[PDB]
Write an enzyme that holds these catalytic residues in place. Structure first.
Site, PDB file in Angstrom:
ATOM      1  N   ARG A  80      20.399  32.869  67.487  1.00 40.36           N
ATOM      2  CA  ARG A  80      20.571  32.519  66.082  1.00 40.36           C
ATOM      3  C   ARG A  80      20.554  33.797  65.252  1.00 40.36           C
ATOM      4  NH1 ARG A  80      16.960  28.112  62.528  1.00 40.36           N
ATOM      5  NH2 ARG A  80      18.653  27.509  61.106  1.00 40.36           N
ATOM      6  N   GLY A  81      21.561  33.950  64.398  1.00 41.04           N
ATOM      7  CA  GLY A  81      21.711  35.092  63.504  1.00 41.04           C
ATOM      8  C   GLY A  81      21.557  34.694  62.052  1.00 41.04           C
ATOM      9  N   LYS A  82      21.772  35.663  61.134  1.00 39.21           N
ATOM     10  CA  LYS A  82      21.675  35.459  59.684  1.00 39.21           C
ATOM     11  C   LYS A  82      22.590  34.329  59.189  1.00 39.21           C
ATOM     12  CE  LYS A  82      19.781  39.101  56.663  1.00 39.21           C
ATOM     13  NZ  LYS A  82      20.104  40.241  55.762  1.00 39.21           N
ATOM     14  N   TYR A  83      23.884  34.344  59.591  1.00 35.40           N
ATOM     15  CA  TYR A  83      24.828  33.307  59.161  1.00 35.40           C
ATOM     16  C   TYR A  83      25.637  32.662  60.320  1.00 35.40           C
ATOM     17  CZ  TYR A  83      23.600  34.906  54.446  1.00 35.40           C
ATOM     18  OH  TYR A  83      22.921  35.243  53.300  1.00 35.40           O
ATOM     19  N   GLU A 104      25.065  30.491  64.550  1.00 33.17           N
ATOM     20  CA  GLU A 104      24.335  29.965  65.708  1.00 33.17           C
ATOM     21  C   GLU A 104      25.287  30.078  66.902  1.00 33.17           C
ATOM     22  OE1 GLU A 104      22.140  25.944  66.009  1.00 33.17           O
ATOM     23  OE2 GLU A 104      21.009  27.029  64.461  1.00 33.17           O
ATOM     24  N   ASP A 106      29.902  47.623  61.652  1.00 32.03           N
ATOM     25  CA  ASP A 106      28.619  47.112  62.145  1.00 32.03           C
ATOM     26  C   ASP A 106      28.359  47.477  63.616  1.00 32.03           C
ATOM     27  OD1 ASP A 106      26.075  45.986  61.715  1.00 32.03           O
ATOM     28  OD2 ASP A 106      26.781  43.931  62.225  1.00 32.03           O
TER      29      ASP A 106
END
Length: 324
Positions: free
Chosen positions: A44-47, A49, A153
């Site tokens: 799970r990340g910031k924005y 899944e 990134d």
């Protein structure tokens, strides 16, 4: 500020049709998520899944990234960029763009990659292993820069490695952007430790060279076994940690060259710092990963001046890679 432009692939987007780089106008075709059965949550990340899934039409493993739809323009940009680079060397392959019939939540379907752990790799990593995987990242960067795209990134978490098959994939193109000479970009990109000096001093006319700074940060942590190499506690502190290795003299020469206005929050924290020799980071625990070639290469990536950094193409021709 003084204007700047990329030394390589400067006009690749200017000479292409509007459809290739105008992500806002791109028509996304959302398939049916019913072709995929979700198996397990991977993370799970910031924005987003991420799920391991099975494509029911061909019994093949896939990775499904269900996006938290916080900005449509950003989802469009990521999709257009993934479509543009689809098939590229060491670029994660977008296999499908699907929406679940009931939720209608945007989801991206990628080729399955079985990532070998970073902490596990760190101990079983050889001098050769570093050179090999660094070259694999350069192939992805030289390719996406040639396609007029900057990843923005680059970091260890966005580099998937299947060590058994010596396979590498550059992932998470959610912050990626098309390069247009003279364009001023948002500096709130990249993860703190990997942010180039240009971002930290609010210099908006940056290019592909940003990715080369981030790659230098990764190389330094790998050869010196110091993760992260530049350990900032905030964005302002991040610049101080770089000045602690590169020195304050070269930083002010950089701000003067591009007539950069320094934020007043740098007033009481920057101090005065000498330039440190790369040799001082060598210890008993890391000396099997270090060599004069590795240090010469690193020095040519970690430069304040984005113009003075090696391009991905020049980096691939460095003596550090003669053995790969």
């Amino acid at each position: 500020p003084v204007p700047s432009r990329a030394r390589v692939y400067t006009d690749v987007n200017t000479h292409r049709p509007s459809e290739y780089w105008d992500y806002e106008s791109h028509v996304v075709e959302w398939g049916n998520q019913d072709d995929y059965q979700l198996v397990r949550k991977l993370g799970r990340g910031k924005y987003s899944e991420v799920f391991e899934a099975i494509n029911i039409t061909n019994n093949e493993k896939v990775v499904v990234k269900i996006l938290k739809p916080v900005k449509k323009k950003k989802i469009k940009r990521e999709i257009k960029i993934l479509e543009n680079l689809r098939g590229g060397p060491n670029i994660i392959t977008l296999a499908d763009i699907v929406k679940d019939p009931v939720s209608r939540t945007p989801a991206l379907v990628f080729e399955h990659v079985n990532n070998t752990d970073f902490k596990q790799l760190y101990q079983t990593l050889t001098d050769y292993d570093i050179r090999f995987y660094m070259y694999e990242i350069l192939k992805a960067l030289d390719y996406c820069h040639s396609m007029g795209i900057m990843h923005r990134d680059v970091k260890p978490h966005n580099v998937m490695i299947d060590h058994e098959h010596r396979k590498l994939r550059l992932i998470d193109w959610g912050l990626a952007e098309f390069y247009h000479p003279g364009q001023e970009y948002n500096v709130r990109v990249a993860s703190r430790y990997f942010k180039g000096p240009e971002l930290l001093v609010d210099y908006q006319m940056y290019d592909y060279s940003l990715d080369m700074w981030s790659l230098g940060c990764m190389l330094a942590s790998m050869i010196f076994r110091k993760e992260p190499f530049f350990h900032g506690h905030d964005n302002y502190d991040q610049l101080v940690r770089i000045a602690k290795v590169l020195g304050t003299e070269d930083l002010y020469d950089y701000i003067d060259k591009y007539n950069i206005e320094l934020d007043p929050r740098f007033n009481d924290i920057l101090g005065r710092h000498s330039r440190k020799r790369w040799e001082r980071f060598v210890h008993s625990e890391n000396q099997h990963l270090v060599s004069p070639e590795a240090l010469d290469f690193l020095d040519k990536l970690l430069r304040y001046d984005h113009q003075s950094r090696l391009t991905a193409r020049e980096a691939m021709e460095h003596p550090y890679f003669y053995t790969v």
